[PDB]
């Protein structure tokens, strides 16, 4: 299925995922797409921060769901 | 000399602030600058911390001389300019600092920061683990702060010669007006870099 990930800059990244994908896998797909290491990424859905060990299915994230990506950056 | 950069982490920054002598403010992630997302941020927003790719008699300013101390300079700019609204703990590291450097220039204040071992030590208690030398030597991200002072939005960056006055605001428009500035003056200028971060400073 497809999910969308919105960044702070207002860009929307489209990802191809399965319900069985873990939040770690989703973060790895974002790195493939955008070069951002997973450890700097936080994913939010329904105002809840998504935990690395859970699946998209665990969170009942369905087709065409939109996640928000927050970056933990070092300045 | 060489400091570890601070991570834009709400928890770390709050704990660092408490330890400096400010426990009355906390930090909250901004997911976007559209009204829909800004509406979820609790009010009153006192400041915006912003990380991005790299006549002011009434504003407290400090020059930056240590390359990776910019996160700490942001916290000083924040608490130095909220000193009236949110007072610092008495005899705390920041209470002592602000009193000592009050009649000093932004330059001389900046150099007193270089000598302040309490602050360097605390910065590095709350900077968050690094993996390799590049985490400390190759830093491509700046850390600045936006505050409201006499009903104007003021951008504070210790690498510049002065505070930057942006515009007027009043009531709870601060967050939304700061968002416009950020999008126009910073984000729009950057094509295809996603490495931005922002935090709202709200009462604890
Ligand atoms: Cl976190």
Curated annotation (Swiss-Prot), chain A:
Compartment(s) of residence: Cytoplasm; Nucleus
Post-translational modification: Phosphorylated at Ser-65 by PINK1 during mitophagy. Phosphorylated ubiquitin specifically binds and activates parkin (PRKN), triggering mitophagy. Phosphorylation does not affect E1-mediated E2 charging of ubiquitin but affects discharging of E2 enzymes to form polyubiquitin chains. It also affects deubiquitination by deubiquitinase enzymes such as USP30.
Site positions (Essential for function): 68
Modified residues ((Microbial infection) ADP-ribosylthreonine): 66
Residues in Ubiquitin-like domain copies: 1-75
Annotated positions for site Interacts with activating enzyme: 54, 72
Effect of residue 68 to G: Loss of DTX3L-mediated polyubiquitination of histone H3 and H4
Effect of residue 48 to R: No effect on HLTF-mediated polyubiquitination of PCNA
PTM annotation (Phosphoserine): residues: 65
Free-text function comment from the UniProt entry: Exists either covalently attached to another protein, or free (unanchored). When covalently bound, it is conjugated to target proteins via an isopeptide bond either as a monomer (monoubiquitin), a polymer linked via different Lys residues of the ubiquitin (polyubiquitin chains) or a linear polymer linked via the initiator Met of the ubiquitin (linear polyubiquitin chains).
Name the UniProt record assigns to this protein: Ubiquitin
Protein's organism: Homo sapiens
Gene that this polypeptide is encoded by: UBA52
Residues of the full protein shown: 1 to 75 of 128
């Amino acid at each position: 299925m497809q999910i969308f990930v919105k960044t702070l800059t207002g860009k929307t990244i489209t990802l191809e995922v399965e319900p069985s994908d873990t939040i770690e896998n989703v973060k790895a797909k974002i790195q493939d797409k955008e070069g951002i290491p997973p450890d700097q990424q936080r994913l939010i859905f329904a105002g809840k921060q998504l935990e690395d060990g859970r699946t998209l299915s665990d969170y009942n994230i369905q087709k065409e769901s939109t996640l928000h990506l927050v970056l933990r950056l070092r300045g | 000399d060489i400091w570890t950069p601070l991570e834009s982490n709400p928890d770390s920054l709050y704990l660092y602030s408490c330890k400096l002598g400010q426990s009355k403010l906390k930090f909250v992630d901004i997911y976007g600058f559209n009204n829909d997302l800004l509406d979820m941020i609790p009010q009153p927003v006192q400041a915006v911390i912003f990380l991005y790719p790299v006549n002011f008699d009434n504003v407290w300013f400090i020059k930056q001389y240590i390359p990776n101390s910019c996160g700490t300079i942001a916290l000083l700019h924040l608490y130095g300019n909220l000193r009236n609204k949110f007072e610092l703990d008495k005899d705390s590291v920041l209470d002592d600092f602000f009193n000592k450097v009050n009649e000093m220039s932004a330059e001389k204040r900046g150099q007193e920061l270089k000598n302040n071992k309490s602050i360097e030590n605390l910065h590095h208690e709350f900077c968050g683990q690094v993996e390799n030398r590049d985490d400390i030597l190759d830093v491509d991200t700046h850390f600045i702060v936006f505050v409201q002072i006499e009903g104007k939005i003021i951008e504070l960056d210790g690498r510049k010669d002065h505070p930057t006055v942006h515009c007027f605001t009043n009531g709870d428009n601060f967050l939304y007006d700061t968002g416009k500035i950020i999008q126009d003056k910073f984000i729009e200028k950057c094509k295809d870099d996603l490495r931005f971060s922002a935090l709202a400073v709200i009462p604890n």
